[PDB]
CSV table of C-alpha atoms in Angstrom, one decimal:
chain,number,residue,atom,x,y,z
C,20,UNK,CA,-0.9,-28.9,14.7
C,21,UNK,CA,2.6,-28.7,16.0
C,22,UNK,CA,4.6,-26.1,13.9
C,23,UNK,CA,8.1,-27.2,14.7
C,24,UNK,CA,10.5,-24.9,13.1
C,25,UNK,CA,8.2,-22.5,11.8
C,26,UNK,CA,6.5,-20.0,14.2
C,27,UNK,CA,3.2,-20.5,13.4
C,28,UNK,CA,1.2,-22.1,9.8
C,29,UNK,CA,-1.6,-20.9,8.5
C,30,UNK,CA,-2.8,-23.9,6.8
C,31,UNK,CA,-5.4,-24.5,3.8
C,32,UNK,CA,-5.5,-21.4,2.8
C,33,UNK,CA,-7.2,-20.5,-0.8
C,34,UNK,CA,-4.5,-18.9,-3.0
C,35,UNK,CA,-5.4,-17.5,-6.5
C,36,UNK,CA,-2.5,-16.7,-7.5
C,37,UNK,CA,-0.4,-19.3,-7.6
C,38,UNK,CA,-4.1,-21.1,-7.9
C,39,UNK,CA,-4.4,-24.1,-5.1
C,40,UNK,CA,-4.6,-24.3,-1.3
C,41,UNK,CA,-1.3,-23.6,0.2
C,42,UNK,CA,-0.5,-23.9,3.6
C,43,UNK,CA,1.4,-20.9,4.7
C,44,UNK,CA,4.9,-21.8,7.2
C,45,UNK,CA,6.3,-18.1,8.8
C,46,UNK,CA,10.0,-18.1,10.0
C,47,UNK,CA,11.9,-15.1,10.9
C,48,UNK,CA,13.2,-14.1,7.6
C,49,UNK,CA,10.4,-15.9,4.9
C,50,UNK,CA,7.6,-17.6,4.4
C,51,UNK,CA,7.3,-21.2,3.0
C,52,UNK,CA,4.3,-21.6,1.0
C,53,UNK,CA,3.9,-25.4,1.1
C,54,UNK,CA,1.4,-26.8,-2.1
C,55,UNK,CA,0.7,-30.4,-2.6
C,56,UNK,CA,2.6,-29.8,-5.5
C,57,UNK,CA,5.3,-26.8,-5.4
C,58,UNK,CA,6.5,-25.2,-3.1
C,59,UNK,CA,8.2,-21.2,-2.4
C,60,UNK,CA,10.6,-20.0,0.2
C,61,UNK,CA,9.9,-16.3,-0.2
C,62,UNK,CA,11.7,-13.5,1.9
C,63,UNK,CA,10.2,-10.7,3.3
C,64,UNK,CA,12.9,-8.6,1.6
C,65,UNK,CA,11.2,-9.3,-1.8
C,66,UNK,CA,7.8,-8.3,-0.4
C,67,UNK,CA,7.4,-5.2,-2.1
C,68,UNK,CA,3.3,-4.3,-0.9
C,69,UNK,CA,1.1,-5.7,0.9
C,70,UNK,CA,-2.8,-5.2,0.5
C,71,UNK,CA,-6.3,-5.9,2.3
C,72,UNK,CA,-9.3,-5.9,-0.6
C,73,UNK,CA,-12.8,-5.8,1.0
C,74,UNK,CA,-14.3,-8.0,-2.0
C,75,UNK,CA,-17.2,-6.3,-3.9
C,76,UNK,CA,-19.7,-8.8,-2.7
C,77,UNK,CA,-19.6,-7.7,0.5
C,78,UNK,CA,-18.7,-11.5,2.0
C,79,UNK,CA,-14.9,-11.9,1.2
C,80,UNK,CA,-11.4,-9.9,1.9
C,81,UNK,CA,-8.3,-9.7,-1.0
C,82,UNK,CA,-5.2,-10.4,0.9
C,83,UNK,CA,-2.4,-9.8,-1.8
C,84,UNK,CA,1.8,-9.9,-1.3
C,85,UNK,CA,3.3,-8.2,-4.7
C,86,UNK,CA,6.8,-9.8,-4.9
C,87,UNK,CA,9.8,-8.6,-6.1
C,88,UNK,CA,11.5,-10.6,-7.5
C,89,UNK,CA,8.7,-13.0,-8.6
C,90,UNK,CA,8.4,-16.1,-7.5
C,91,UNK,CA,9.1,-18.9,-10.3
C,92,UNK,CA,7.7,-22.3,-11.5
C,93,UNK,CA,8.8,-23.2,-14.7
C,94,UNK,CA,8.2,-20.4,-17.4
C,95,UNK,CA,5.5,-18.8,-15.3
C,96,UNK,CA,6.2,-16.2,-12.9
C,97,UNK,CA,4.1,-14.8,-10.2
C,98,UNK,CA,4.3,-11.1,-9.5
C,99,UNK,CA,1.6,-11.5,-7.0
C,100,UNK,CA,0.7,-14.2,-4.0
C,101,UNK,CA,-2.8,-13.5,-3.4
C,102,UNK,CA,-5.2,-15.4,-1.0
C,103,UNK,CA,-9.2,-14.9,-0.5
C,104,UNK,CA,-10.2,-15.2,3.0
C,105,UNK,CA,-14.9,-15.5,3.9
C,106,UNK,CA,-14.8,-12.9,6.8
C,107,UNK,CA,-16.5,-15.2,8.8
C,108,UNK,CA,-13.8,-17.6,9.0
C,109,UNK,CA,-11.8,-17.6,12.3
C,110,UNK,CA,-8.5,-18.5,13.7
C,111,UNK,CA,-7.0,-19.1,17.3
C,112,UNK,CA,-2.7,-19.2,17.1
C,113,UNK,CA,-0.4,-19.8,19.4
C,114,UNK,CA,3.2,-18.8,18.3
C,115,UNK,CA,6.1,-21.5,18.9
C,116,UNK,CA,7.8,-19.3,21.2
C,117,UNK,CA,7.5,-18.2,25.1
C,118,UNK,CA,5.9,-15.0,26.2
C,119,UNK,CA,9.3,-13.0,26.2
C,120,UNK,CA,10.3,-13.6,23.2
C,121,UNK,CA,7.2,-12.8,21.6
C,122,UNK,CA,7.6,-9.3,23.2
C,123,UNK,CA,11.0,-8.9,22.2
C,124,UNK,CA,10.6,-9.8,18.6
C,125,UNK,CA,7.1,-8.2,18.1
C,126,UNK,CA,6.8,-5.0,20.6
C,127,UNK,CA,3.8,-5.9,21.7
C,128,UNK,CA,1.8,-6.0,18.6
C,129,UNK,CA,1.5,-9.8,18.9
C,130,UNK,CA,0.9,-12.1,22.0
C,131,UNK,CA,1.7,-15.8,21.8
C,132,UNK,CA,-1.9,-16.9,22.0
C,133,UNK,CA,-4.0,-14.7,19.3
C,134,UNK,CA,-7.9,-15.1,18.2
C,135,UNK,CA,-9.7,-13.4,15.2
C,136,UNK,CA,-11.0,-13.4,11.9
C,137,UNK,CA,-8.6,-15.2,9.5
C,138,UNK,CA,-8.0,-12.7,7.2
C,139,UNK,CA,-7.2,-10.6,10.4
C,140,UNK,CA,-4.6,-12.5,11.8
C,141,UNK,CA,-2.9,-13.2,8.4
C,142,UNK,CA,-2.6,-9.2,8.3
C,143,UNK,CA,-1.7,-8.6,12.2
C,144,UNK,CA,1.4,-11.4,11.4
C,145,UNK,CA,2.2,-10.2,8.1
C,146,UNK,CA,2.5,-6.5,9.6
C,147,UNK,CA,4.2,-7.6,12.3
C,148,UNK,CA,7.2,-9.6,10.2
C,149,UNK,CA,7.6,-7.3,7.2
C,150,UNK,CA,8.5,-3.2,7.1
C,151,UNK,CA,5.2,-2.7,4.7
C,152,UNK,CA,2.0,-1.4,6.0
C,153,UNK,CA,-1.4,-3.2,5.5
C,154,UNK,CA,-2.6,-1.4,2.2
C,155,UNK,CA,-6.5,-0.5,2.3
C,156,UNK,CA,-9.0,1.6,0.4
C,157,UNK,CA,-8.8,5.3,0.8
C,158,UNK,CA,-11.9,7.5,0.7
C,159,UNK,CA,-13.0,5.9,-3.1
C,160,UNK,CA,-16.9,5.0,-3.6
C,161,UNK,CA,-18.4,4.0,-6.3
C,162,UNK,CA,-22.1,4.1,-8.1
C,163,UNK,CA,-23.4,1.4,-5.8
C,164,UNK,CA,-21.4,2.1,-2.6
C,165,UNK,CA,-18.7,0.0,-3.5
C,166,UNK,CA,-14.6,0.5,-3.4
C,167,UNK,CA,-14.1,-1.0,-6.4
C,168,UNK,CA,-15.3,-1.1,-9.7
C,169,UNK,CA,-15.8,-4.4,-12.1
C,170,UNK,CA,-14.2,-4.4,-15.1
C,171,UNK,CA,-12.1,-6.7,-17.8
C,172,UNK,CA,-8.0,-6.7,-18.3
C,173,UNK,CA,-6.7,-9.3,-20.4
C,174,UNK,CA,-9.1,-12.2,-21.1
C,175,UNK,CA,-11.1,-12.5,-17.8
C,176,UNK,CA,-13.0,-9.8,-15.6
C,177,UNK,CA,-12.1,-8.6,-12.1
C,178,UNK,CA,-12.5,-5.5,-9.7
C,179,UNK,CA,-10.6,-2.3,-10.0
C,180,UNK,CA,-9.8,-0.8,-6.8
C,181,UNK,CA,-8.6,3.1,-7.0
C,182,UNK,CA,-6.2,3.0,-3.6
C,183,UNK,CA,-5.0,6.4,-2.1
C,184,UNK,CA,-1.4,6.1,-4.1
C,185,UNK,CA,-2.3,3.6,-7.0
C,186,UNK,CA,-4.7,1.4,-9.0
C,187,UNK,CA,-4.8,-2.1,-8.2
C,188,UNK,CA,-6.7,-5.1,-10.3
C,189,UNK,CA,-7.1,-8.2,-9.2
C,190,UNK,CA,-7.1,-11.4,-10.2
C,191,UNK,CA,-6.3,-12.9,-13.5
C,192,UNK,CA,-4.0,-11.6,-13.7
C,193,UNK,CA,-3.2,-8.9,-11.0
C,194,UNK,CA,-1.5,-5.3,-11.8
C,195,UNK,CA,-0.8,-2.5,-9.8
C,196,UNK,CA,0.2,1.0,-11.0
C,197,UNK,CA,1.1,3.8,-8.8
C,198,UNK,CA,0.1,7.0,-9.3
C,199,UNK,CA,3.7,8.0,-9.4
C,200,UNK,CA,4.0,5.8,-12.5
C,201,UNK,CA,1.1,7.2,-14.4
C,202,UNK,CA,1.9,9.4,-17.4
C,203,UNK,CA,-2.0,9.8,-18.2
C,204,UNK,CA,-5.1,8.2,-18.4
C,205,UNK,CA,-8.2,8.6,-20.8
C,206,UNK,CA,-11.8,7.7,-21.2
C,207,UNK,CA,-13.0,5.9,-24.3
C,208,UNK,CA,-16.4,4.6,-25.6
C,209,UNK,CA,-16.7,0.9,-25.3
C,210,UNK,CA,-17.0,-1.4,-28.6
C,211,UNK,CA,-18.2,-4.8,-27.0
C,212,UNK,CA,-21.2,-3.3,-25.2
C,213,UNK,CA,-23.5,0.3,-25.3
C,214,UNK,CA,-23.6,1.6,-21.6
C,215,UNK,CA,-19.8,0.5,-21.1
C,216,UNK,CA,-16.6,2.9,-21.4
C,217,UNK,CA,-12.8,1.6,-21.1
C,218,UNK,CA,-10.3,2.7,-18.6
C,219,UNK,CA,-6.7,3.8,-20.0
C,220,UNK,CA,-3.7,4.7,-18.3
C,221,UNK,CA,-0.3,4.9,-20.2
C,222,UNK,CA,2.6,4.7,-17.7
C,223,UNK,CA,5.8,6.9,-17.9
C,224,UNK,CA,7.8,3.5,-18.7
C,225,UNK,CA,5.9,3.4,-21.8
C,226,UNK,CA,3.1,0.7,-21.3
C,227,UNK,CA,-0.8,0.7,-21.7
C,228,UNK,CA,-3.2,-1.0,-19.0
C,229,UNK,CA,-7.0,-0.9,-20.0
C,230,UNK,CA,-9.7,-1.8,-17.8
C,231,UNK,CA,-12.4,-2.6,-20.3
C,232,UNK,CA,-16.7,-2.7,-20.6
C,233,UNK,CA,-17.0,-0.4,-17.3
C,234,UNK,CA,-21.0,0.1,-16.5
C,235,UNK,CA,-21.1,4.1,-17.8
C,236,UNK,CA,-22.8,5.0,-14.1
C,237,UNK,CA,-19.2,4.6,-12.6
C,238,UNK,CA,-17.8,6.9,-15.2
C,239,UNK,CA,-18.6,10.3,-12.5
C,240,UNK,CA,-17.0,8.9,-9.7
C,241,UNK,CA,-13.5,7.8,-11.5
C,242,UNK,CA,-13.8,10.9,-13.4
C,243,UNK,CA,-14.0,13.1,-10.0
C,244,UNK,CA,-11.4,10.3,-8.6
C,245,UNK,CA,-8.9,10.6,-11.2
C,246,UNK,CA,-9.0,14.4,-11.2
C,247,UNK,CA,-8.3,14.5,-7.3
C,248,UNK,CA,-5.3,12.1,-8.0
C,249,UNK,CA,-3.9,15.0,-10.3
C,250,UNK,CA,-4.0,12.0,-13.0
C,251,UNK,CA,-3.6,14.0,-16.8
C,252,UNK,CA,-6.5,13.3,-19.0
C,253,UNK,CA,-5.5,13.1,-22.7
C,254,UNK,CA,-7.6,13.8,-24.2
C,255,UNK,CA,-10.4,16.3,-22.9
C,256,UNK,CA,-11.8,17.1,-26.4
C,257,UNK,CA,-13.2,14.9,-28.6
């Protein structure tokens, strides 16, 4: 329970991506994600985003780190640490250091004895150690009610979230485009299933990202969505 050189571990958390429970060690310049297995020093310099994901199932929260560079382990490379916190779990932490120095280092946005939800406290500490702000859902609502919207990439499904400056999918495997990287995006009937569209977007780097057998009821709302974005539909006609 001691942390010893670390300032505080969050400990057994459940990572996707890299898959396993991973006990998270923060220091003042990186975090240590300690596996049974591997293990990844990664500095806050190379954090390039950080999200929060309400899950669709109204029961679990998405925190996700997009790194830059990726972290390694042999040929693999993960673009993405992302953990899956039950709102219900909770957390007390006490910060290896003295009152003073947790107001000098934090400005007040941290105290040395903290309670909370998990997922919570993993953002408050994240925020508090890295320049990136907590990246949440913007105004976007689905068919149901939901902010995202479940769909396939690649060879397994997931949940596309349509943030205020960008798409992100998570989890197998995760993406994110920003708006700013989007050249267009179109609509097309689905083959595998009747009632079911795909999700296009060519980026202006020259790559294609679709988000495949979408339920035809969310087509209005990312229609209206991608439209307030100022996204380009090619085509309108046809």
């Amino acid at each position: 329970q001691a942390t010893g050189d670390a300032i505080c571990i969050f400990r057994e958390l459940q990572c996707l991506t890299p898959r396993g429970r991973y006990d998270i060690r923060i220091y003042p310049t990186f975090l240590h994600l300690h596996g049974k297995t591997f293990d990844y020093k990664i500095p806050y310099t190379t954090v390039l985003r950080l999200f929060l994901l309400p899950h669709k199932d109204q029961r679990q929260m998405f925190f996700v780190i997009s790194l830059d560079p990726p972290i390694k382990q042999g040929q693999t490379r993960y673009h993405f640490l992302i953990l899956l916190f039950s709102k219900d779990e909770d957390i007390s932490l006490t910060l290896n250091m003295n009152e003073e120095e947790v107001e000098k280092r934090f400005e007040g946005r941290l105290t040395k004895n903290m309670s909370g939800s998990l997922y919570e406290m993993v953002s408050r500490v994240m925020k508090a150690l890295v320049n990136r702000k907590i990246t949440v859902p913007g105004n976007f609502q689905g068919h149901s009610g939901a902010q995202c919207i479940t769909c396939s990439y690649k060879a397994s499904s997931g949940l596309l979230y349509p943030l205020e400056r960008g798409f992100i999918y998570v989890h197998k495997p995760p993406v994110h485009i920003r708006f700013d990287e989007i050249s267009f995006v179109n609509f097309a009937r689905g083959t595998t299933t009747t009632r079911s569209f795909d999700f296009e977007i060519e980026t202006k780097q020259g790559t294609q990202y679709t988000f495949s057998s979408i339920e035809r009821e969310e087509y209005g709302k990312l229609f209206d969505f991608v439209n307030a974005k100022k996204l380009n539909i090619k085509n309108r006609g046809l």
